[PDB]
Amino acid sequence: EICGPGIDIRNDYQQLKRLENCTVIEGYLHILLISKARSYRFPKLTVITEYLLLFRVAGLESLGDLFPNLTVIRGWKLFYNYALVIFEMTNLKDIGLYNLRNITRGAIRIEKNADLCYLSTVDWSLILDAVSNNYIVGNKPPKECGDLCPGCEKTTINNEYNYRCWTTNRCQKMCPSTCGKRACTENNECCHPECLGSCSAPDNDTACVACRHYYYAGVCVPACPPNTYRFEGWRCVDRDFCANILSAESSDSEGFVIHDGECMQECPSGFIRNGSQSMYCIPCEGPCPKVCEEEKKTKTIDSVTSAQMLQGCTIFKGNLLINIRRGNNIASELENFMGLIEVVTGYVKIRHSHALVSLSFLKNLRLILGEEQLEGNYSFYVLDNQNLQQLWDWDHRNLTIKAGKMYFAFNPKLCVSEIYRMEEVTGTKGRQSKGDINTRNNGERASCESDVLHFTSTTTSKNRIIITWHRYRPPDYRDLISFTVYYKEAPFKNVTEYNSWNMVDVDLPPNKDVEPGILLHGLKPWTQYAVYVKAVTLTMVENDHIRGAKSEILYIRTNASVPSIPLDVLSASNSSSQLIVKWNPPSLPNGNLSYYIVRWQRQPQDGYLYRHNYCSKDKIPIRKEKEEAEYRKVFENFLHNSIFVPREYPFFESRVDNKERTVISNLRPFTLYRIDIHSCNHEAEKLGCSASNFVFARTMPAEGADDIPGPVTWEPRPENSIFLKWPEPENPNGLILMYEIKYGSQVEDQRECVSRQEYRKYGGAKLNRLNPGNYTARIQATSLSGNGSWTDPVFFYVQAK
Amino acid sequence: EICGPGIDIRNDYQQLKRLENCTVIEGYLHILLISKARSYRFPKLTVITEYLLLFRVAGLESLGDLFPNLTVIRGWKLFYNYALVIFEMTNLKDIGLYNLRNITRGAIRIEKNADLCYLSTVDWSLILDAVSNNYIVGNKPPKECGDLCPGCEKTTINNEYNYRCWTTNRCQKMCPSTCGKRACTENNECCHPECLGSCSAPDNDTACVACRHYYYAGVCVPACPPNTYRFEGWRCVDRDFCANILSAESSDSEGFVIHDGECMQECPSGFIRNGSQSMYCIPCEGPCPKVCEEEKKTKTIDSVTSAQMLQGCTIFKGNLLINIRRGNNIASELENFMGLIEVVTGYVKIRHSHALVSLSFLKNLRLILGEEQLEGNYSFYVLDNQNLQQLWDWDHRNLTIKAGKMYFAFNPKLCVSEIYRMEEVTGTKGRQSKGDINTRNNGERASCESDVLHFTSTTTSKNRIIITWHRYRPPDYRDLISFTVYYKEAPFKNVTEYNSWNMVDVDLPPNKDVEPGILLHGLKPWTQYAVYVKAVTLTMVENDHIRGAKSEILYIRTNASVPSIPLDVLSASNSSSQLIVKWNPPSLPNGNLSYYIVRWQRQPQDGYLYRHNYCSKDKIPIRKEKEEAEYRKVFENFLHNSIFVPREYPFFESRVDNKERTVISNLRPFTLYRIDIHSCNHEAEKLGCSASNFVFARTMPAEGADDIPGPVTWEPRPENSIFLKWPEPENPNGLILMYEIKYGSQVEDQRECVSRQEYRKYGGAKLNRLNPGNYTARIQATSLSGNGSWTDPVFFYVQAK
Ligand SMILES: *[C@@H]1O[C@H](CO)[C@@H](O[C@@H]2O[C@H](CO)[C@@H](O)[C@H](O)[C@H]2NC(C)=O)[C@H](O)[C@H]1NC(C)=O
Ligand SMILES: *[C@@H]1O[C@H](CO)[C@@H](O[C@@H]2O[C@H](CO)[C@@H](O)[C@H](O)[C@H]2NC(C)=O)[C@H](O)[C@H]1NC(C)=O
Ligand SMILES: *[C@@H]1O[C@H](CO)[C@@H](O[C@@H]2O[C@H](CO)[C@@H](O)[C@H](O)[C@H]2NC(C)=O)[C@H](O)[C@H]1NC(C)=O
Ligand SMILES: *[C@@H]1O[C@H](CO)[C@@H](O[C@@H]2O[C@H](CO)[C@@H](O)[C@H](O)[C@H]2NC(C)=O)[C@H](O)[C@H]1NC(C)=O
Ligand SMILES: *[C@@H]1O[C@H](CO)[C@@H](O)[C@H](O)[C@H]1NC(C)=O
Ligand SMILES: *[C@@H]1O[C@H](CO)[C@@H](O)[C@H](O)[C@H]1NC(C)=O
Ligand SMILES: *[C@@H]1O[C@H](CO)[C@@H](O)[C@H](O)[C@H]1NC(C)=O
Ligand SMILES: *[C@@H]1O[C@H](CO)[C@@H](O)[C@H](O)[C@H]1NC(C)=O
Ligand SMILES: *[C@@H]1O[C@H](CO)[C@@H](O)[C@H](O)[C@H]1NC(C)=O
Ligand SMILES: *[C@@H]1O[C@H](CO)[C@@H](O)[C@H](O)[C@H]1NC(C)=O
Ligand SMILES: *[C@@H]1O[C@H](CO)[C@@H](O)[C@H](O)[C@H]1NC(C)=O
Ligand SMILES: *[C@@H]1O[C@H](CO)[C@@H](O)[C@H](O)[C@H]1NC(C)=O
User: Listed disulfide bonds for this chain (chains A, B)?
Assistant: First the structure.
């Protein structure tokens, strides 16, 4: 008995009766807002695909009271990456799912259960996989609970080992070590590899509580038989089953598809249904066509959300009504949704679209039919567009209106010639009436043919640009003339005319010998700016020949400057005599980075250190709201007055020509290094390369270099004394601070500390006044990185004579 | 020798010579980017007002090498709340300022000094005050340093006590305990209370290294003498000194002012200079006038940053040139800067200001003179404003143009009547020429007198509004008529016409018996919306009488709905039988909150707990990227299908009529409580009050309620046994889990555990088979909150007979 494709039980506590016969729940399960007021127990349920959710169920004390035999929660579809959600469950004392074995996908969210115990008593690491992403907060604190399993087994949690159980009467069932990844029966006999959870009988396909791969005819098959297909994620159905499945009712709702041996709702991305609503998907070349079908016969695009419904459509079975009064970046936003619409089965009406200066956002639209036409047989109908300068009718575009006429009225900024060129490609020359296209109220303010403004000279700095164009006499002697400079930051040249354009109005100079120009104030160094000037011809005599002047879009890049310091210098040592160091490109390069120049200087071993007698110390040293961005900016501004011109310890200098990583070679092991890193550019040979962002790093210690390189010698001396002599390590890791002699008669119990200064005087150490007998001794040098290895024992005797 | 008002030594290491004679540095001190290559030592310097900054000084090993006698850094003005910044100082080993005593204001920033030791050896808690906000990161790690003071005193850092010193040769100077807040000489004789730091001689005004209040004539005065004034924050100067001080050169730079006995740069907020540039400030009523003076004779307002310079000005000594092509919210942003400008000494030119539909942002502007006028004697000159519908010339405003004419041209949306009404208040009737104001190219598209659209019916839901207005026959029979509905969320009624307005175009219905209306889709419940309809009259016959239709701004509020759950319920217990609980108003009230309704239910003491024998246990219980907002939203949507209609343990119910806080009375001490909190509204008596956001809280334990209420009695029993009998605590804190008997012959060494179930059987405990002798015994009850007090000893004997 499969139940689905989704159970949502809420409010009525009696509504839980829908689970009387369900053994598997295909899809999620929701038990919400239940107020229990006899009990309900469902031992039939064992498997739940997708997730299980519980929320605000009053009266329920344990989950075992409802689903005691629940074994596998597949989590095929998750509730926000959660396969089990127990949230705000009052009166609930424990997760009584003592038969739960495997949660195949997702995490667990257990939250806000003031009486929920037996949380730490469950080893979730063996029932699910992603234990790290589990969410168990806000439950009953373990300090005030009292978990006590009846009296079973136990295992390791972190470094702790404690008992495991689900409730106060049942323990956590586990499988023996011999089955490995397989499952086991209650009697601990291994279950068939394709099984999952428990077994009605050991090693049998038809005796499984839940299959781990797929299910068909009572058998746990790895893959579906040849004539069956994967449905959901656990069972196999035949072809006649998915020909009867229907998706959620929508405007373009259809049946399910068979693809890649799976029976899914829609064809996946990059696939389209073969034939006419057939059951199979065919690979579609490049972009796959999505025909959009809507209930409303005339789709009205009056906002930005209305256009979102036409996103990615290739053909529109309906009528388009554009009505866009407001909108700033809609010219490029509509092109995201409607830029792929190619065919319109009906008519297109551009009414009251004051925000549209052009129709270029309707790219790829090459076919308009005329299945339904506006009153009077019209397939293209624009009206009252106070800013429509041009159509999408560039001479590159293609268009074909099958049937209908075109009506144009009250579009003042649209040149009347542009709509005569439309019916050329449209193919409706002479099909319209005499009033459909009228020079009155259309093209009244249109400035069609314009002149050309020619730039004359440009001068660049690192932040200023001076540009001058030729004087422009207006077409009529009586026109008042003024200019308007449009300039904006354009990283590359493909620029559309006015938009985040910066505008300034400069007047024609009074003296006729000087030409009009403009000075730009504060610009970023080495930045390409798109500039073009436009004339303002206020004609006292209107129309006759409305004539403006426009210049070409000139791209001017400012000069380069001193670069910024490299960002976040990090360094490590993977080996002695080697230093790796990485960084990030500077904040303001101001040109082409070209290369980096890095310098490393040896640092002296710390002053003093040689001076102190480290046999007296107890610790010997070793070695291996928020406006702070404005604070650090002040110190970056200081680094402009000092640059770096490239060419006691000396600096070594190397150029890194491409990457932001480099490895330094030939270094003294366990020595500190000052790593100066600069950033130059292509103009840094005259501007000077940038300042330095430096870091300090120490290399790895030379292994085995701080131990005694020779044998220990001994010489008897006055009293009952012995003088141990040993060679000094030539190249220690940093510096040898002290030696330790470990000697004794039977056990090397007596220990003698030999300071560095003591060894420099005598070349060894004198063991003072020993008891007679046979002795052994071991010596160990301690450097700055650490100690070396003990020497092999030296043997000396003190005679009692 | 006072040096200032700011020393900035950088780059040139020889430039440090400017401190040869300075004993006090008035203002900050900057030593940056220095590269030392003989040494420089300045024992003269002792005091530094404001802060001291050091950055990237190579070669310097200790700060004592430069300023050994530096005693007081006043920090009058801070470098971002820092009085001392030592950042990226290479080769620096220690802060050698061994004479530093008091840092009066600010924190310390010591960062990125890889060789800086002697940081933990300094007790900064006695030289500065805000030790919490200090920043000491990125220096030499204390593990690899080796701080060793020569060989002085020591004190407590946190819970540690260690030696204090500045460098390897000098220690941290401190003052004896007898001086308290006062200062001390090197020889530990207390310094005059007005002194600070050290003393040339004990207890003398003229023998101070630094005064703590102020300084004058070699004396540390608390306040300045009557004829002197506070300058900076340490010395007193006479009146003739501040009459010679000049601020930083600006467009309106003047001398300093004397105010409140202090000599400051400008008059403080709420004060203006008396007379004509005098030395004293006078209280100005309400808003204080700020006359703005600029070098550029004609200020050009062509952007949003240019207007920021005119912020708060009352009078403008110059000419205003408005040229605003772009800008959305500039109509209300310009009113922030220019809304207080009242008088303009020159002319005003509104050129190419297409973004301006009105000049209302120039509020309070009531006077325009004419000191300089545009060519042709013009004081008001507008030109080419394609959207200027009206001036700021409301009949409420006042204006007076002293001299000059007014020229109007190429303003199409400006009604020609509006500028005739201007020269009424302006007072220039007949002063202009015949071409200065022309009906041509002015008012060409202006729709002056308009009709009135009347609403007919409105219907409201919780998210939808239907509104219908009367049918409108256009003035001309041949006009095409359409409507445009403007509606936007308006919390209150003061609304300006079109702006974040939502617009939709509805057509006049074909049937003449039905009136035009519109249905609004998804609105917030209980929200006031401003709605008004506007007619679109496309006149086939242009002008004659351009006539539009506009409606009144109708304010419609939607219905109320079920409120949201209260936010973040927190609860605590300040006393037994009392529970305080606070919360936050719901996310979506949907009406007037009116009141809250809270419920508290007693929770039963945990099941079991009574069952276990807690004398065997070892621990007895006690008690006292980020889309999770979308996750929690799903659970808030679930709480709409279940509401609360207001009226084993019973629920107690109380109404909170105003605040979001309440205190529950009459409770059982140390008992858990379920606190259900709902949020109602004025319509919740029919809609139903909202769901509950509940919390659990336990009250305080009843003090002394879990101890024995009577004396202990003993009775001899068979063997050598004793049966101790004691009364049970009537009202324990939660529950008595176990008793402990502490008995012995000479010392109460033997301890007997008495479980709760054992006491229920016998009413006491039997001490089993004791050795003969005299005994004492003490008993203690352990409840859920904790243990009670031991009983006074009971005395019993075991005879050996
Ligand atoms: C629950 O069962 C599933 C499926 O039987 C287990 O999923 C395995 O996940 C690992 C992860 O690398 C894959 O390599 C295996 O191939 C998966 N199994 C199969 C049959 O494909 C999952 O590990 C099980 N979880 C627990 C806790 O036992
Ligand atoms: C900005 O770059 C231009 C070149 O793109 C510089 O003009 C050059 O200036 C040098 C002066 O050292 C002359 O020798 C060259 O002949 C100039 N080249 C051209 C094409 O004019 C200009 O000087 C740079 N700006 C600054 C401030 O250095
Ligand atoms: C350094 O000296 C100043 C001024 O002498 C001290 O400032 C005192 O701050 C407390 C804070 O509550 C005030 O109550 C006192 O009135 C201030 N002193 C005076 C004279 O007004 C500051 O505490 C001193 N810092 C150290 C570390 O001694
Ligand atoms: C929204 O509020 C209006 C009143 O402002 C409601 O209109 C009332 O509806 C009740 C129905 O129970 C009638 O008894 C009243 O006479 C109506 N008053 C008016 C002034 O018309 C309207 O029903 C509310 N909307 C909803 C969905 O309940
Ligand atoms: C469940 O099975 C019973 C028989 O035991 C049957 O009467 C009933 O109709 C089935 N379905 C439901 C929803 O109870
Ligand atoms: C211009 O071209 C570049 C690269 O071809 C592209 O990244 C950018 O989006 C284009 N911009 C426009 C406005 O076409
Ligand atoms: C900077 O780099 C770009 C990209 O490779 C290149 O086109 C340009 O010529 C370079 N500029 C110079 C001055 O080499
Ligand atoms: C340091 O001493 C320990 C002590 O036995 C030794 O194991 C270790 O090898 C020594 N270090 C080196 C580098 O030999
Ligand atoms: C500092 O004092 C000396 C006298 O010791 C004098 O010669 C010099 O001019 C003064 N000023 C400076 C800046 O050195
Ligand atoms: C409307 O008035 C309210 C209160 O008087 C005020 O907070 C708000 O800013 C005003 N808005 C406008 C546009 O005047
Ligand atoms: C809601 O509160 C406001 C503010 O006090 C008040 O003006 C309004 O009348 C109230 N509404 C009702 C229905 O009482
Ligand atoms: C709990 O026992 C300690 C042990 O002496 C005692 O000091 C304390 O007062 C006891 N608690 C109470 C509430 O009496």
Answer: 3-22, 117-145, 149-165, 152-171, 175-184, 179-190, 191-199, 195-208, 211-220, 224-236, 242-263, 267-281, 284-288, 292-313, 415-448
CATH node for A291-426 = 3.80.20.20
Beta strands in B610-729 (DSSP E): 651-656, 661-665, 672-679, 695-698, 713-717, 721-725
The strand pair at B315-322 and B348-351 is best described as parallel
The CATH code that applies to domain B2-190 is: 3.80.20.20
The Cβ-side half-sphere exposure at A249, using a 13 Å CA radius, reads: 1
Where does ligand 11 bind, in terms of residues with CB under 6 Å? B 592, 682
CB of A250 less than 8 A from some CB of B: no
A674 vs A669: CA distance, rounded Å:
14
Tell me the nearest-neighbour CA distance from B83 into chain A, angstroms.
14
Q: Determine the Cα angle at A350 with ends A367 and B475, to 5°.
A: 150
**CA-wise closest residue to B571 among B664, B651, B666:** B664
Please give the structure tokens belonging to residue A436. Answer: 């459909």
Domains A291-426 and A451-558 share a fold: no
CA dihedral B386→B387→B388→B394, nearest 10 degrees, is 160
Choose among B342, B320, B327, B451: nearest CA to B387. Answer: B327
* Nearest-CA distance B151 → chain A (Å): 13
Q: Compute the distance from residue A657 Cα to the ligand 2 centre, in Å.
A: 26
Angle value at C-alpha B654, between B652 and B655, nearest 5 degrees: 160
Q: How far is CA B319 from CA B324, B357, B399, in A?
A: 16, 21, 17
Backbone angles phi, psi at A283, to 5 degrees: -60, 130
Q: Which two tokens stand for residue A95?
A: 């997760």
Q: Give the residue from B460, B465, B455 showing the smallest Cα distance to B534.
A: B455
Residue among A447, A452, A488 at smallest CA distance from A470? A452
Distance CA(B641)–CA(A55), nearest Å, equals 13
Strands A82-87 and A107-113: parallel
Question: Do residue B622 and residue A144 have CB atoms under 8 angstroms apart?
Answer: yes
Please state, as a whole number, how many other Cβ atoms lie within 10 Å of the Cβ of residue B248.
Answer: 6
Strands A451-453 and A378-383: unpaired
* Best residue for ligand 1 mutational test, from A74, A102, A174 (most atoms within 8 Å of Cβ): A102
Q: Hey, what are A186's tokens?
A: 């209650």
**Domain B451-558 -> CATH class:** mainly beta
User: Cis peptide leading into A141, omega within 30 of 0?
Assistant: no
Tokens 């038969």 sit on residue: A99
Residue B373's SS3 state is coil
Cα B57 from Cα B11, distance rounded (Å): 9
Place of tokens 């030790």: B131
Q: What is the resolution of this structure in A?
A: 3.0
Could you tell me if B154 and B162 are in contact, meaning their C-beta atoms sit under 8 angstroms apart? yes
What distance in Å separates the CA atoms of residue A605 and residue A623, rounded to the nearest whole number? 12
Q: Ligand 7: distance of its center to the CA of A685 in Å?
A: 16
Helix, strand, coil percentages in chain B from 3-state DSSP, rounded to 5:
10, 35, 55
Contact indicator for A550, A534 with CB cutoff of 8 Å: yes
**Ramachandran class of B31: left when φ > 0, alpha when ψ lies in -120 to 50, beta otherwise:** beta
**A449: its two tokens:** 């043919």
Tell me which amino acid residue A342 is.
E
Q: Is B543 on the interface with A (CB under 8 A)?
A: no
CA–CA gap between residue A746 and residue A774 (Å, rounded)? 8
> Which of B148, B606, B698 to substitute to test the interface with A, most A CBs within 10 Å?
B606
With contact defined as beta carbons under 8 Å apart, do B598 and B676 qualify? Answer: yes
- For residue A544, give the 3-state DSSP assignment: coil
Pocket of ligand 5 (CB under 6 A): A 20-21
Query: Which residues are registered as beta bridge partners of A644?
Result: A689
